[PDB]
Amino acid sequence: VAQGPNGRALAESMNPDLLSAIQQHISIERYASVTYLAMSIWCAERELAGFYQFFDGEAKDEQSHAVHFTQYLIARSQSNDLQTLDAPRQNWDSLASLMATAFQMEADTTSSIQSVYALAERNSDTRTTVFLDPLIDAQIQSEDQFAYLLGRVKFANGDPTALLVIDNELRAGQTQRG
Amino acid sequence: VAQGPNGRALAESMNPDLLSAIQQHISIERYASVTYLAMSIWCAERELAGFYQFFDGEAKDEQSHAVHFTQYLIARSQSNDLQTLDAPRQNWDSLASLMATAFQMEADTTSSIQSVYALAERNSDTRTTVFLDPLIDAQIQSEDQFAYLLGRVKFANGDPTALLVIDNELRAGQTQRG
Amino acid sequence: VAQGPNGRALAESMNPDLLSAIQQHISIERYASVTYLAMSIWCAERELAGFYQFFDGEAKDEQSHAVHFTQYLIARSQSNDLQTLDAPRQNWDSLASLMATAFQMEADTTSSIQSVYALAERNSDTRTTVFLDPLIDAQIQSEDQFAYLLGRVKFANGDPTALLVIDNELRAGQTQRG
Amino acid sequence: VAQGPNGRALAESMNPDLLSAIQQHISIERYASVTYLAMSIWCAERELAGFYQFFDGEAKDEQSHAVHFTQYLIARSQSNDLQTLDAPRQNWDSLASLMATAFQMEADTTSSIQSVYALAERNSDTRTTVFLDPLIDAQIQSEDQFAYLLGRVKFANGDPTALLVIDNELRAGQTQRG
Ligand SMILES: [Cl-]
Ligand SMILES: [Cl-]
Numbered sequence: 281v282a283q284g285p286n287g288r289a290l291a292e293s294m295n296p297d298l299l300s301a302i303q304q305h306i307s308i309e310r311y312a313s314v315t316y317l318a319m320s321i322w323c324a325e326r327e328l329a330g331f332y333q334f335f336d337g338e339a340k341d342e343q344s345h346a347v348h349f350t351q352y353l354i355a356r357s358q359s360n361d362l363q364t365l366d367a368p369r370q371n372w373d374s375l376a377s378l379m380a381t382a383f384q385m386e387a388d389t390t391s392s393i394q395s396v397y398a399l400a401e402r403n404s405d406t407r408t409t410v411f412l413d414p415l416i417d418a419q420i421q422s423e424d425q426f427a428y429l430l431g432r433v434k435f436a437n438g439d440p441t442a443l444l445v446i447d448n449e450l451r452a453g454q455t456q457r458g
Numbered sequence: 459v460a461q462g463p464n465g466r467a468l469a470e471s472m473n474p475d476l477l478s479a480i481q482q483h484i485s486i487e488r489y490a491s492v493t494y495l496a497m498s499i500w501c502a503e504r505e506l507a508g509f510y511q512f513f514d515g516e517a518k519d520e521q522s523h524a525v526h527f528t529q530y531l532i533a534r535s536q537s538n539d540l541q542t543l544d545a546p547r548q549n550w551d552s553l554a555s556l557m558a559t560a561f562q563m564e565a566d567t568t569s570s571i572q573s574v575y576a577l578a579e580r581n582s583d584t585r586t587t588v589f590l591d592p593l594i595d596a597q598i599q600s601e602d603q604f605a606y607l608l609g610r611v612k613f614a615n616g617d618p619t620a621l622l623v624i625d626n627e628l629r630a631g632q633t634q635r636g
Numbered sequence: 637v638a639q640g641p642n643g644r645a646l647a648e649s650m651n652p653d654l655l656s657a658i659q660q661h662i663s664i665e666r667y668a669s670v671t672y673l674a675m676s677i678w679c680a681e682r683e684l685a686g687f688y689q690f691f692d693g694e695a696k697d698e699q700s701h702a703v704h705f706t707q708y709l710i711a712r713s714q715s716n717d718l719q720t721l722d723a724p725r726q727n728w729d730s731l732a733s734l735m736a737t738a739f740q741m742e743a744d745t746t747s748s749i750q751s752v753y754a755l756a757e758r759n760s761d762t763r764t765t766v767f768l769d770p771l772i773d774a775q776i777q778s779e780d781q782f783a784y785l786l787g788r789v790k791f792a793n794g795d796p797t798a799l800l801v802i803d804n805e806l807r808a809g810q811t812q813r814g
Numbered sequence: 815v816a817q818g819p820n821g822r823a824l825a826e827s828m829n830p831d832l833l834s835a836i837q838q839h840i841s842i843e844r845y846a847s848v849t850y851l852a853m854s855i856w857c858a859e860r861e862l863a864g865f866y867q868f869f870d871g872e873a874k875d876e877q878s879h880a881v882h883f884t885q886y887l888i889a890r891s892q893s894n895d896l897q898t899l900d901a902p903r904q905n906w907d908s909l910a911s912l913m914a915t916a917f918q919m920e921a922d923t924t925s926s927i928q929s930v931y932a933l934a935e936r937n938s939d940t941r942t943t944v945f946l947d948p949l950i951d952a953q954i955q956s957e958d959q960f961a962y963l964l965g966r967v968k969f970a971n972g973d974p975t976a977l978l979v980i981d982n983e984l985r986a987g988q989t990q991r992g
C-alpha cells in the first residue's frame with residue numbers, strides 16, 4: 281500500500297494540476313463566504329433585515345462547501361493548502377447592484393467547479409467527477425434562486441416600498457420560486 | 459452595623475453626588491416612559507396601530523427600568539426621591555420626525571447611565587458599575603433597534619404605502635433586525 | 637440626529653483608533669477560525685477523529701465570534717472593514733506541538749480583546765467594555781479548556797495508546813474538566 | 815420490440831466487451847465478500863471481536879453489491895454469468911498487514927468499477943455510467959473509511975493495548991472519522 285501526499289493510505293494518485301485546481305476552488309468557496317458576509321453587513325447597515333439574514337446564512341453555507349472540499353482531499357489522501365483569502369467587495373450603490381454581484385459570484389463559483397470537472401475528465405479521475413456532480417446540481421438550484429432574487433429586486437425598480445416587501449419575504453424564508 | 463439614609467442596615471456608604479445622579483436618572487427613565495406614551499398616542503391618532511402597540515410597550519418597559527433603579531437604591535440603603543415629571547413632547551410633523559426623537563431619547567438615556575457610571579468609577583463604587591453593566595448592554599440593543607426602526611421609516615421616504623407595510627411589521631412583533 | 641460612518645443613526649461617536657482596533661480584532665477571530673480548520677485537517681489526516689471533530693467545531697465557533705463583532709460595529713453605526721486573511725499554520729511535528737499552538741492562539745485572542753478593552757477604557761467607551769465583558773468570560777473558559785486538552789496530551793507523553801484514549805474522549809464530547 | 819440475450823424485452827443493446835466487464839466485476843464484488851469473511855475469521859481467531867463484527871458486516875455488504883450488479887444486468891436484458899470464485903487469502907502476520915490487504919481490496923474494487931466505467935464511456939452507454947456513479951461515490955467513502963481504520967491500527971504500532979481500544983471502538987460502531 282502506497283502513502284499519499286498527506287500521509288494516508290493512497291487509493292489512487294491524483295494529477296498535481298488537478299490537486300492545485302481543487303485547492304484553488306476551496307479558496308473560491310471561502311471567498312464566496314466572506315463576500316456573502318460583506319453583503320449581509322451592507323444589507324444590515326440599511327435595515328434590510330431579511331436580506332441580511334439571507335446572506336448571513338449563505339455565508340455559512342459557502343464555508344460548509346469549502347470544508348466539504350477539504351474533506352474530499354483528505355479522503356483522496358491529498359494535501360490541503362489553505363490559502364491567503366482576499367478581502368471581499370464591500371461597497372455597492374444599490375441593492376440591485378449588490379444582487380448582481382451576488383449572482384455573478386454564484387455563477388463564477390459554478391465556473392470554477394466546471395474547470396475542475398474538465399480537468400478531472402482529462403485525467404480520467406472518475407472519483408472527482410462523481411464528487412462534483414451533486415455540487416453542480418446544487419449550483420443549478422442556487423443560480424436559479426439568485427436569478428429569482430436579483431430579478432425580483434430589479435422588478436422593484438428601486439421603489440423602497442417594493443424592496444421592503446421583498447425584504448419581508450426573505451425574512452419569512454420565501455427565498456425562491458418554489 | 460450602621461444604618462443608611464433610608465433606615466436599612468448599610469453595607470457601604472454612597473457618595474451623595476452619586477446618589478443624586480441615580481435619583482436624577484430615575485427621572486430620565488420615567489420621562490422616557492411618558493415620552494413613549496405620548497408617541498404611542500400620536501401614532502394611534504394616525505391609525506398607525508403597529509407603532510402605537512410598539513410604543514405602548516416601550517412606555518411600560520421604561521417604567522420597569524425606573525422601578526429597577528428604585529430597587530437598587532433600596533438595596534443600597536439609600537433614600538429614593540421621586541421627582542416632578544416634565545410633560546413630554548407631544549407634536550411631530552411626521553413619523554420620521556417622531557422616530558428621530560425616539561432614537562434621541564434612547565441615546566440620551568444611555569448618556570445618563572454613562573454619566574452615573576463615570577461618577578461611580580470616580581468613587582470606586584463597584585456595586586454600582588456592576589449594577590449598570592447589564593443596563594448598558596440593554597441600551598446597546600435598544601439603540602440598535604431604534605436605529606433600525608428609524609432607518610426603515612426613513613427608507614420609506616414618506617410613502618404612506620411603505621409606512622403601512624412597516625406598521626404591519628411592528629404589529630406582528632417584527633421590531634428589530636433579528 | 638447624526639449619522640454614523642456606516643450611515644445609520646449614531647448614538648455616540650467612536651474614536652477612530654478604537655474602531656480600527658475592533659476591525660483588527662475581527663481579523664484575529666477569523667484567523668483563529670481558519671487556524672482551527674487547519675488543525676482539524678491535520679488531525680483528520682492522522683485519523684485523530686475526535687480531535688478533528690473538536691477543532692471543526694472550534695473553527696465554526698470562532699467564525700461566530702467574528703460575526704458577533706461585526707454586529708456590534710453595525711449596532712454602533714460604525715463601518716466594518718473585512719480584511720485580507722493570512723493563510724494559517726498547517727504543519728506540526730506532533731499533536732502536542734499542535735495543541736501548544738492552539739493554546740497560544742486562544743491566549744492571543746484574549747490578548748487582542750484585552751488590547752481593545754484598554755483602548756475603550758482610555759476613551760471612556762462603556763458600551764464597548766460592556767460588550768467585551770462576556771467575551772472575556774468566555775475566553776477564561778476556553779483558556780481553561782485548552783490548557784486541559786494540552787495538558788492531557790502532554791501527560792500522554794507521545795504514547796499512541798494514550799492519544800487514542802484521549803481522541804475517543806473528544807469524540808464523545810468530553811472536552812473539559814467539568 | 816427486440817429481445818435481449820436474457821430473453822427480456824431490450825431497451826438498448828450492450829457491447830459484449832462491456833457485458834463481459836460487468837460480469838467480471840460481479841466476481842470482484844463476490845471475491846471482496848469472501849475476502850472480508852476470511853478477515854472476519856482471522857480477527858475472531860485472535861479475539862478481536864470488534865474487527866470480527868466489522869468485517870462480518872463488510873462481507874454481507876459486498877455480497878449485496880454483487881447482487882445489485884446482477885439486477886442491473888437483468889434490467890438491461892443481459893445475461894448473468896456467475897463465475898467460479900477463487901479462495902480468499904486467509905493468513906496474515908499482523909492486524910496491520912490484514913488491514914493493508916483490506917484497503918488494497920477496497921481500492922482494487924474501485925479500480926474494477928473505473929475500468930467498467932471507461933468502457934461504458936467508450937461505448938456511449940450512459941445508462942451504465944449513471945448506474946455506476948453512486949457506486950463510485952460509495953467507494954470514496956469506503957476508501958476513506960478503510961484508510962482511517964488502517965491508519966489507526968498503524969498508529970497503534972503493534973501495541974496490544976492500543977489494538978484492544980480500537981477493537982472496542984469497532985464493536986461500538988465507531989468505524990469512521992465522522
Ligand atoms: Cl435597488
Ligand atoms: Cl414619515
Ligand SMILES: [Cl-]
Pocket residue numbers: 730731732733789793794
Ligand atoms: Cl504528541
Ligand SMILES: [Cl-]
Pocket residue numbers: 908909910911967971972
Ligand atoms: Cl498490528
Ligand SMILES: [Fe+3]
Pocket residue numbers: 309312341342345346389
Ligand atoms: Fe459554494
Ligand SMILES: [Fe+3]
Pocket residue numbers: 312342386389422
Ligand atoms: Fe454558492
Ligand SMILES: [Fe+3]
Pocket residue numbers: 487490519520523524567
Ligand atoms: Fe430605560
Ligand SMILES: [Fe+3]
Pocket residue numbers: 490520564567600
Ligand atoms: Fe430606553
Ligand SMILES: [Fe+3]
Pocket residue numbers: 665668697698701702745
Ligand atoms: Fe473567539
Ligand SMILES: [Fe+3]
Pocket residue numbers: 668698742745778
Ligand atoms: Fe477562541
Ligand SMILES: [Fe+3]
Pocket residue numbers: 843846875876879880923
Ligand atoms: Fe463492493
Ligand SMILES: [Fe+3]
Pocket residue numbers: 846876920923956
Ligand atoms: Fe468494498
Ligand SMILES: [Fe+3]
Pocket residue numbers: 413414947948
Ligand atoms: Fe449523479
